[model samples]
Target: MTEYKLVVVGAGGVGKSALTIQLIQNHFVDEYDPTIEDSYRKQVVIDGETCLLDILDTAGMRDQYMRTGEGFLCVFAINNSKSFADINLYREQIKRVKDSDDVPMVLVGNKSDLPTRTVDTKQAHELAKSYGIPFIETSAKTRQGVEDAFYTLVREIRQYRMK
Candidate 1:
């Protein structure tokens, strides 16, 4: 099977764990966790082709495992505009830590269940477009857009590896 290493990153309380758990485990963590970087493996099929993905949660993760050729998901919460804005800085850190500018990356907005969105979807969408990367909105609570985000990243990784 094909394989990928996916890094999910964002500011605290933006529901990174919630989104990941929802995708890989089909359930919810439902709370913010102040925890170590956990490693998880799951099978994801993108476009009807099954593949394996190695997920590394970035909350407390060290940089040693980062590589010049890993896929990244820079996540934020739509309700918190600052988190959405911080994605640019996070992308820089990824380039520095992974030592690559050509790394495959996606900007994801989490907690899309917000009734009051502080980060306009159009704004985020434009920024991601400017970077030539994919932008996705996800809600862990309602199971909306969660799997879509994960599958998107895995496919991006697959594409990256092909070249």
Candidate 2:
């Protein structure tokens, strides 16, 4: 089994930790409560392969720690325009820290359960297309697209390693 080190980065209120916890623990946290910063390790099977996911949930981007991550989830909230606009900053830093032009990454639009919308699916799709990465919309509250987002990262990592 392989251990996939993944980092979740986004703006202040994009629910990065919520998505991480939903994938790891199958629970959704409240909006008012904030995670200072945390990491977790869990063993799971993805695509018939047993592997461990070591997830780092963060409030803001960290360049140094990005070096150790095999893949990244560039998350933003659909209802928050600022969060969506800030995903590029995280992407640039991750590439720089890893010293690679191409890296295993996913563009995530979180808080899909919310009724209000500021960032639409088409725009998210266009952004992911520019980077040639997979894009997904997720809702930690509903447990939607949470596993796929992480599993997709694992698949991306595996593919990158193979190449």
Candidate 3:
């Protein structure tokens, strides 16, 4: 089976782990589930083929992914402006790690269900546009853009490998 790794990276309290856990267990889950230990592994069909996709970060796997030039799903919080501000830095970190500005990424602003959104959607969209990446706002509480965000990143990863 083709192995596609999608890992979460973000600051603490951005709901990275909590929201990611909701996504990990809910989406395409039945035959696959989170690990009892640290790493989370699951199989999902991507591009009409069953693939082994890792949702949580495994030891050396994320760096392994970046070293192999896989796409990244960078998470942020809509209620936190500093989290949004860190996007460019994260982008740069990805570039530096991959040694290429063409590193595939999708900008995700989580916590959309909250009313105290500090970051503007238009601004996030523009930032994503500048990076040539897609921007999506998500709410893990009620599940707004979770599927879209995950699907978009996985889809992009598949597409990136196609070329």
Return the TM-score for each candidate structure.
0.91, 0.96, 0.82
lDDT of 3: 0.71
- Which residue pairs of candidate 3 clash? none
The count of backbone overlaps in candidate 2 is 0
lDDT agreement with native, every candidate = 0.81, 0.89, 0.71
Please, what are the lDDT tens digits per residue for candidate 3 over residues 93-124? 77877878766678889889889989989989
Q: In angstroms, how far off is 157's CA in candidate 1?
A: 1.2
Query: Which is better, 1 or 3, measured by TM-score?
Result: 1
Over 97-117, each residue of candidate 1 has an lDDT whose tens digit, in order, gives 866776788889888888989
Model 2 is weakest, by summed lDDT over 10 consecutive residues, at 29-38
After superposition, candidate 3 runs with Cα above 4 Å error = 27-38, 57-65
Residue 113's lDDT in candidate 3? 82
* Model 2 lDDT tens row, 1-163: 8899998889988888889888888898886356478889999988889998899888655677798888999999999999988989988888888889789999999999999998989999999999999999999899989988989989999999999
Using alpha carbons, what is the TM-score of model 3? 0.82
Looking at model 3, residue 76 earns an lDDT score of 84
RMSD of 2: 1.2
Q: Rank order by lDDT, top first?
A: 2, 1, 3
Tell me, what's the RMSD of every candidate? 1.8, 1.2, 4.8
